[PDB]
């Protein structure tokens, strides 16, 4: 009766950062030793929680957010951060309580030609609220003239494609990111350790 962490981390494919997948985890006993004893992750930054102490307490719900970004944008997955990813694709609250986990995936997400399947939002009139998911494909209106759904002058497609190629530098290489969010509301606790 263990929680399905492997379905998220070890997934064959990952979603684009703008359409970041979220897996609600509840009513299961979670063993996190497979995570903090691992050696594959490049970054593992925990805010407000201690991964070693993960197999000791209880929570109401745990969220696993999956997406792919660049190496230069892994820094943007952190509370109080600013950037294209943190403002328009995936935002963490300042009071974030959880862990952000990333690892290099230049072998799974980089093709000889540009993968061009992972996308991110390039234009947005306002920043994203924390844990907000915007998957709109509406033509961005950069001027006062309406776009009517056709790209052109002052009318840009809000999404851009990551050019993941194996010959690029480490910063340009894709990184698969799984964000662990721990929710403890005044409700029966369903997620616990051993």
């Amino acid at each position, epitope marked *: 009766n263990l929680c399905p962490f492997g379905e998220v981390f070890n997934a064959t494919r990952f979603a684009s950062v703008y359409a970041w997948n979220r897996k609600r985890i509840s009513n299961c006993v979670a063993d996190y030793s497979v995570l*903090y*004893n691992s*050696a594959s*992750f*490049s*970054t*593992f*930054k*925990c*805010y*407000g*929680v*201690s*991964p*070693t*102490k993960l197999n*000791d*307490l209880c929570f109401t719900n745990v969220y696993a957010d999956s997406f792919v970004i660049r190496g230069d944008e*892994v*820094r943007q997955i952190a509370p109080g951060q600013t950037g294209k990813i943190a403002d328009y694709n995936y935002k963490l609250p300042d*009071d974030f*309580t959880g*862990c952000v986990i990333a690892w290099n995936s230049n072998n799974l997400d980089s093709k000889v030609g540009g993968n061009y399947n992972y996308l991110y939002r390039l234009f947005r009139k306002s920043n994203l609220k924390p844990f907000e998911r915007d998957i709109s494909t509406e033509i961005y209106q950069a001027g006062s003239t309406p776009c009517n759904g056709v790209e052109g002058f002052n009318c840009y497609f809000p999404l851009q494609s990551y050019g993941f190629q194996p010959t690029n530098g480490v910063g340009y290489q894709p990184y698969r990111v799984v964000v662990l969010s*721990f929710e*403890l509301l005044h409700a029966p606790a369903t997620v616990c350790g051993p």
Partner: antibody
């Protein structure tokens, strides 16, 4: 399953530069944020700063903001505490502590490094 | 800059009796989103580095004997050593990790009363 081992005792003259070391070994250290605690002879524990080795993100105590520099090298899993110009007021034993995140308790500690700054 | 002042400075408790240490906080150290106070207790035997005993004001570190109990909430926190073995002669600090910079207490020395 991680342990912290620090550098040896240092005896220096005032005005000398110093750089003590703190290496961690075991299962993990990707979750561990490494801080530095000062303990002057007969005094309590003073928190100097903290650094995440993976991205070298550093946070300093206001009392130690510009007096000391905290660096790291993720290649060898080793954090550093560096002084550009030592003073007799720096004569203290320095511990490096490790916790599995920011705003988390420090569960792994080093053995401590004794620094004596005298003429 | 959360201030932590703890009393008493020195404590004398006989072998097997109860040792109590109070830790006073300037600001609250409670995370509402998780409902856990971010306060810890440390033990430092002479000539040795500090060792983490209790975290989150109630939970003791693995390997700590069941005679070390944490208590309190808000700005008032107490460390209770039920019974007292001679292996507990050290200085105990209370440290907060609610917000940077981390701050310790001034220290409380525990001696065996004879």
């Amino acid at each position: 399953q991680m342990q912290l081992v620090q550098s040896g005792t240092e005896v220096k003259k005032p005005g000398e530069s110093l750089k003590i070391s703190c290496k961690g070994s075991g299962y993990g250290f990707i979750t561990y944020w490494i801080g530095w605690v000062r303990q002057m002879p007969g005094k309590g524990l003073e928190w100097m700063g903290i650094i995440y080795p993976g991205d070298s993100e550093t946070r300093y105590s206001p009392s130690f903001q510009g007096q000391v520099t905290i660096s790291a090298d993720k290649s060898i899993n080793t954090a550093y505490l560096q002084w550009s110009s030592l003073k007799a007021s720096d004569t203290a034993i320095y511990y490096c502590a490790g916790g599995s995140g920011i705003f988390t308790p420090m569960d792994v500690w080093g053995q401590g490094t004794t620094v004596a700054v005298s003429s | 800059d959360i201030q932590l002042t703890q009393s008493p400075d020195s404590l004398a408790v006989s072998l097997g009796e109860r040792a109590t240490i109070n830790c006073k906080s300037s600001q609250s150290v409670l995370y509402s989103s998780i409902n856990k106070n971010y306060l810890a207790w440390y033990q430092q035997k002479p000539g040795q580095p500090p060792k983490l005993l209790i975290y989150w004001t109630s939970t003791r570190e693995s390997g700590v004997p069941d005679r070390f109990s944490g208590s309190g909430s808000g700005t008032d926190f107490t460390l209770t050593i039920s019974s007292l073995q001679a292996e507990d002669v050290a200085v105990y600090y209370c440290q907060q990790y609610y917000s940077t910079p981390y701050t310790f207490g001034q220290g409380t020395k525990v001696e065996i009363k004879r």
